[PDB]
Design an enzyme around this catalytic site. Structure first.
Site, PDB file in Angstrom:
ATOM      1  N   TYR A  47       0.619  -1.095  -0.267  1.00 30.67           N
ATOM      2  CA  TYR A  47       0.019  -0.003   0.167  1.00 30.67           C
ATOM      3  C   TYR A  47       1.447   0.975   0.227  1.00 30.67           C
ATOM      4  CZ  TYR A  47      -3.600  -3.206   1.108  1.00 30.67           C
ATOM      5  OH  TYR A  47      -5.019  -3.934   1.000  1.00 30.67           O
TER       6      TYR A  47
ATOM      7  N   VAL B 192       7.118   2.757   2.888  1.00 31.24           N
ATOM      8  CA  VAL B 192       7.574   2.317   3.930  1.00 31.24           C
ATOM      9  C   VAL B 192       8.550   2.868   4.678  1.00 31.24           C
ATOM     10  CG1 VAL B 192       7.414   0.842   6.375  1.00 31.24           C
ATOM     11  CG2 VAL B 192       5.970   0.337   4.495  1.00 31.24           C
TER      12      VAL B 192
ATOM     13  N   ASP C 140      -3.903 -11.650   4.442  1.00 30.77           N
ATOM     14  CA  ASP C 140      -1.998 -11.309   2.769  1.00 30.77           C
ATOM     15  C   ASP C 140      -0.781 -11.465   3.727  1.00 30.77           C
ATOM     16  OD1 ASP C 140      -0.543 -11.160   0.665  1.00 30.77           O
ATOM     17  OD2 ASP C 140      -0.656  -8.946   0.924  1.00 30.77           O
TER      18      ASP C 140
ATOM     19  N   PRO D 182       6.172 -13.646   4.792  1.00 42.03           N
ATOM     20  CA  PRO D 182       7.344 -13.519   5.310  1.00 42.03           C
ATOM     21  C   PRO D 182       7.986 -11.696   5.677  1.00 42.03           C
ATOM     22  CG  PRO D 182       7.912 -15.695   4.319  1.00 42.03           C
ATOM     23  CD  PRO D 182       6.309 -14.828   3.810  1.00 42.03           C
TER      24      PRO D 182
HETATM   25  C1  CK2 Z   1       7.246  -3.530   3.266  1.00 39.49           C
HETATM   26  C2  CK2 Z   1       7.349  -3.201   4.558  1.00 39.49           C
HETATM   27  N1  CK2 Z   1       7.146  -4.443   5.705  1.00 39.49           N
HETATM   28  C3  CK2 Z   1       6.676  -3.495   7.261  1.00 39.49           C
HETATM   29  C4  CK2 Z   1       5.573  -4.729   7.379  1.00 39.49           C
HETATM   30  C5  CK2 Z   1       7.217  -3.260   7.537  1.00 39.49           C
HETATM   31  C6  CK2 Z   1       8.354  -2.533   8.652  1.00 39.49           C
HETATM   32  C7  CK2 Z   1       8.928  -2.621   9.647  1.00 39.49           C
HETATM   33  C8  CK2 Z   1       9.455  -2.419  10.239  1.00 39.49           C
HETATM   34  N2  CK2 Z   1       8.135  -2.092  11.734  1.00 39.49           N
HETATM   35  C9  CK2 Z   1       7.305  -2.259  10.719  1.00 39.49           C
HETATM   36  N3  CK2 Z   1       6.125  -2.273  11.268  1.00 39.49           N
HETATM   37  N4  CK2 Z   1       6.791  -3.225   9.825  1.00 39.49           N
HETATM   38  S1  CK2 Z   1       8.325  -2.605   6.232  1.00 39.49           S
END
Ligand code: CK2
Length: 294
Positions: free
Chosen positions: A15, A18, A123, A126
């Site tokens: 989405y 990050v 969804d 890993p």
């Molecule tokens: C792509 C990413 N997916 C997740 C789930 C990420 C992440 C990395 C660190 N902390 C959190 N909560 N989320 S980065």
């Protein structure tokens, strides 16, 4: 957003991007996610707000939901690593069974909690299973799928994986149940044990046929109503079920028994998270400390 100083990009999510960031007014480091163009529908806003309440030790905490300038930003608790990298880093000797059992055990707890509230992930993979230095593993991005219709190809044009997608979904069932998460987890469980993805499909049909080759092509006997599903085709090749002792060595009898129930074709026969927690495989569960190198 003003109150957050991005430290680095953690990756491209389903989405949006990050970022690892630091809240300027609290000093806490977090995981910031930018979502998406209409202005974000009210429905999405309420679904997400509900997620702010389902808190659990094995569910990555949703800290804040910032809807500003007609933009959606989700702030999550930050964890230093995902199971994907951890697995790649443990490829040589594999993740020790005790740790595998601990992780599966905690994941099922998180799932049992969300499922008891009628909230599914849809969804699991890993990449959204995060771990810390204290032997804990948590589910990330829980519930976002229902909030936003999951796309086939991310904004970054990256292909979303189908490796962990339940057969009812591949076959066109439009009403997923909590059973899809159990299937995904079972696939991940198998992957940790063998150190190789269970069903590495690169297309829906390839994904479906890989499932059919290992578990046998489903019929009305093992899955009532399977032939009446939207994408079921009488013309599907008829494969025989491989025996689990061949699919996941050297997992013991308890593990194979449990894996088999998490992989039942019929969604209604598939074991629930709750019942799974009582399975004999967890008789000797403990909480080992992973060897993490950040
Ligand atoms: C792509 C990413 N997916 C997740 C789930 C990420 C992440 C990395 C660190 N902390 C959190 N909560 N989320 S980065």
């Amino acid at each position: 957003m003003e109150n957050f100083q991005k430290v680095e990009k953690i990756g491209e999510g389903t989405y949006g991007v990050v970022y690892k960031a630091r809240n300027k007014l609290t000093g806490e480091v977090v995981a910031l996610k930018k979502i998406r163009t209409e202005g974000v529908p009210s429905t999405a806003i309420r679904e997400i707000s509900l997620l702010k309440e389902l808190n659990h030790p094995n569910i990555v905490k949703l800290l804040d939901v910032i809807h500003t300038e007609n933009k959606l930003y989700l702030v999550f608790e930050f964890l230093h690593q995902d199971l994907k990298k951890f697995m790649d880093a443990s490829a040589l000797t594999g993740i020790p069974l005790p740790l595998i059992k601990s992780y599966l055990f905690q994941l099922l707890q998180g799932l049992a909690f969300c499922h008891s509230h009628r909230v599914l992930h849809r969804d699991l993979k890993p990449q959204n299973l995060l771990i810390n230095t204290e032997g804990a593993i948590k589910l990330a991005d829980f519930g976002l799928a229902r909030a936003f219709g999951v796309p086939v190809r991310t904004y970054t044009h990256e292909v979303v994986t189908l490796w962990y997608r339940a057969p009812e979904i591949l076959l066109g069932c439009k009403y997923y149940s909590t059973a899809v998460d159990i299937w995904s987890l079972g696939c991940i469980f198998a992957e940790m044990v063998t150190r190789r993805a269970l069903f590495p499909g690169d297309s829906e049909i390839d994904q479906l046929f890989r499932i059919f080759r290992t578990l046998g092509t489903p019929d009305e006997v093992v899955w009532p109503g399977v032939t009446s599903m939207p994408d079921y085709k009488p013309s599907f090749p008829k494969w025989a079920r491989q025996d689990f002792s061949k699919v996941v060595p050297p997992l013991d009898e308890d593990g194979r028994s449990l894996l088999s129930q998490m992989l039942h074709y019929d969604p209604n026969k598939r074991i629930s998270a709750k019942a799974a927690l009582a399975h004999p495989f967890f008789q000797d569960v403990t909480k080992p400390v992973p060897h993490l190198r950040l």
